[PDB]
Amino acid sequence: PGGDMSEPVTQSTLRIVGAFWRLDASLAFRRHFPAINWNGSYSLFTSALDPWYRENVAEDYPELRDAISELLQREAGLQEIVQLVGPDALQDAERLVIEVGRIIREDFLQQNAYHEVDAYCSMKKAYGIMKMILAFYKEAEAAIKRGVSIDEILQLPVLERIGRARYVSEEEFPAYFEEAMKEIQGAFKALA
Amino acid sequence: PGGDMSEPVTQSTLRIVGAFWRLDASLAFRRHFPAINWNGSYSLFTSALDPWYRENVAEDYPELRDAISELLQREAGLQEIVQLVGPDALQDAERLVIEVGRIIREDFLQQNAYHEVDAYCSMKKAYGIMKMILAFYKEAEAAIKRGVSIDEILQLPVLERIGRARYVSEEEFPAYFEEAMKEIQGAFKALA
Amino acid sequence: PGGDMSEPVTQSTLRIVGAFWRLDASLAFRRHFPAINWNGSYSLFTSALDPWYRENVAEDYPELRDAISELLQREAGLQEIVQLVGPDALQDAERLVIEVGRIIREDFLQQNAYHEVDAYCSMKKAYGIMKMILAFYKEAEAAIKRGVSIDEILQLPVLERIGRARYVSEEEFPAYFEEAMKEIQGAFKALA
Amino acid sequence: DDDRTHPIPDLTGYITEGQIQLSRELHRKGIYPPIDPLPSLSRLMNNGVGKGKTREDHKQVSDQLYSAYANGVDIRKLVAIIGEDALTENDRRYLQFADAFERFFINQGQQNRSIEESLQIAWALLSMLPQGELKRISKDHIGKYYGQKLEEIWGAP
Amino acid sequence: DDDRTHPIPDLTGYITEGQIQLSRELHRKGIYPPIDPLPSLSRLMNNGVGKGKTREDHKQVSDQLYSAYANGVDIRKLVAIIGEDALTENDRRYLQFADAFERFFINQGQQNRSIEESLQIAWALLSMLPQGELKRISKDHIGKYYGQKLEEIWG
Amino acid sequence: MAVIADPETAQGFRLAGLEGYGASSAEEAQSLLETLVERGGYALVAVDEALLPDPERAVERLMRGRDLPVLLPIAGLKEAFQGHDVEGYMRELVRKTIGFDIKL
Amino acid sequence: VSPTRMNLLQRRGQLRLAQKGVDLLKKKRDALVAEFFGLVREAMEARKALDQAAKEAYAALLLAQAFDGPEVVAGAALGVPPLEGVEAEVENVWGSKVPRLKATFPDGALLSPVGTPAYTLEASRAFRRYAEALIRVANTETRLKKIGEEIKKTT
16 A cells, blocks of 8 residues: 555465565666566575476576576675765776676566567576576686786677577577677687 | 644634644743744635735735745755754855744744733734845845855844844834844945 | 553552562563663652661661662763764763773672572672772772773773672672772772 | 545545645745646556657656756755755756746746647756756757757746 | 643643643652643743732743743754764853753752742853843843852852 | 984984984884874974884874874885885775775 | 654654655765765875975985085084974864964075085975975875765764
């Protein structure tokens, strides 16, 4: 009624359901669709479906999903510093996770239901997109350990090939995914 | 009962009367009478009475009344900030508003029903007091823009002259008004 | 029900009883027992028992009790300022009051009902403990004016003697009291 | 008692499509009709405006006006503490836009404005803000309609 | 409870001609009699005071005391919010007045004061404020009675 | 203006007309600084970097009384011929002021 | 707190006021930080200018000591009278006071106009330029510290 989640109906509903997708209008104001608050949402079918996932999609799927969730969790702790000082004063190690969090939040969690191919997405396409994002993050961190500026990582053309993975058809995905993986591997080989 | 304005009798009366004069306990505790809560009171006869005011008091009386109401509204808006951070954190253009609102509250709105003279006030005396307050506010706003500090304006000896215009009898007020207007004109002109 | 002290049974009882010993859940959470709220409790029999105290315990016992009550009141007054500005910003004459209040709270008011000695306390033992605490406070207040730091006073070994005074049996206490008094005098005479 | 959790305003929200809210502050400041745009809302607006119904630029202009007013009110609240000299360049522009908006768009008196006149005044108000700060409006409408002066209604009370 | 809005005190206040309200906060500080002057009221006060009954300055002194004590009470909250080091001189004067008012005027013990002694103490307390801030008192009474020090009676 | 350091720069400081004293050890520097602050009259005091890194860190019991004297650390003798880490010193300053120690 | 329907609305108004005050304080902190992160850069530049001036003054005095001799250097130090004309002013910054140094650096108040110990004269100029850069460092330092403490208070 008043937007409060202590209502008797919501409290009685929270006690018997196995999933809870809490929408929020704060992400709808900024035109982020779907507007699911990933901090408050939960699901109790996560663990028990993993044998199906590893017997149907891929063996490393739960670990990759947990890695993406941990990347999203890491960015949530740095907002107390971004809301005090602007992003341009943050250390490069933290700036990397801020950029990767923005990339995840605006390329993987975002979905166009009005689009020709983006409205439908199978498990393997999402698995490939997560693989590409994790490869980007790990190679960027390895380059940081070598010693690089953040702007040369952001300069790389693989940002658009990791962004345009949503709009590829399901028939062209198994070639595009391997091409993008080899391209990012070579591009991070061509770095100091 | 108990000062609860959500009582059925009070709510029934609110929907049929044309004017509402709500009294306050907090103002009555500090012996500030008539103790009218300005924020909770209203009148619906203001617009229909304007030709009579123009014909029988002055041609610009509604404008003076509107100016006083807008000043009170500005003071009520600033009261939130002054309750948050205190009075010394405001700029001079807001401290002037606070002091003028206090002058209005303790000079124009206050009235002693047991005093010999203050028990009755005519329309023209109130018009003169409003004109004096507005003239002082305009001159003080002109002085603030000229670099003069707030802390020296309110220590002028003319605030006692304005603050004690209540007790001037009706037979002496036409002289007192013209004596105070020239002093208001000259005090800020002579200032540095 | 729920700790609500405005329920009818509680309010009906307060109109007939002479003493009101109020318990607090906040003190019981941190294992501070007997968990008596010394700000909300009262007793109407205090003034009628003074002739008994003056002839059965000591002739100056009421003055000592009033001094301890005054110290508790001053500590409660300072703890409002402490919790929003920090104890480091306070002067030495206030940090001394804070430390003495903590010593009173943990050495005198606190009593263990399951200890073999602390379960019972005579009147003379309590009077001796009060005398020791007040003597220490007087000496520390005298020595603060010579410029001694609070950290020098807090590291004195005689602070441990007062804290262990309540575990001393009723037989050994009249000698331990004299040793502690002489030790306090010697430690604050040899102090810097 | 200005309570939206009272049962009568609460149940009206479950059946109707949006609301229009009057403001006591705007009324006490002398503005008529005292309609506060921030809590007001219409839930069928997008189905009734647009190409061939009102005009091409209606929706984006409304969004830009909403966002600019929302910025201006908070800047106005900040000025009372930090002063008008500590502001940046665009903040003073936002503050002046808020004052002009309340003086001209809302406070219309007893005028009967057509939708063309309302859109003309709205486009003249947005021209106070620098071009390129109007994110919510596409560049074609800006090229077609930006740049008019508010003196056309300043001299027409 | 400590509730003025309970039905019994509410109806009693609607029927009677004022009330004397006691304060637990004043009682915990050792003040007797712990009478809180702000929520207290006497409706028939104006009939029995003034010239020819007690003294001609009674009502104005009462009103000025009420206003000054209310100002000091309000300044206490500002001190509790922002700290007592950011005050001006006027606020500190009002704070000192409130503390001295509680410690000297209200707290009297078992002694029996005459009306003249009480008015003398009241004028002693008002002399701790600047002469220009006594708005509710007439200038003649200010000229007649201002200036006496508190230590001439309690020192 | 008062300034305490190695005498080799104190000589130039009294050449310029500024009051100068020599220091060689930690206790000597602390005693000299405490006497300088306790003695009144001046507005600015400069202390070294080799012996005492933070001047106001030791006078904390005295600087809370009056605020007119200003303390300031300067470089040493051999350090000025090669410089020091101004970036590190200001990073430490940002840590002590804003509390988060995150700046690049 | 007496439970009534009026007090509920009063509490909810207070809650709205508290949330809006939190937002306003956050905006004020943002403005303070934006000022601080340029003030620190000015402090950096002033500090490195002082470092270069220190380098050149130390080199000049070392060269004067090695060649001209400690006796003449000590005599030139003795001849020059001390300086006292430090002009101090108190200025507000973001609603808080700071001291500032505006030392006179008087011309003609020093001794030894003869330039025969030429390297000694150069060092006498260089250390005065050192003292000129010193207060330029100090006035930025004190303002930086005050703005940092205001940020701490807002947080």
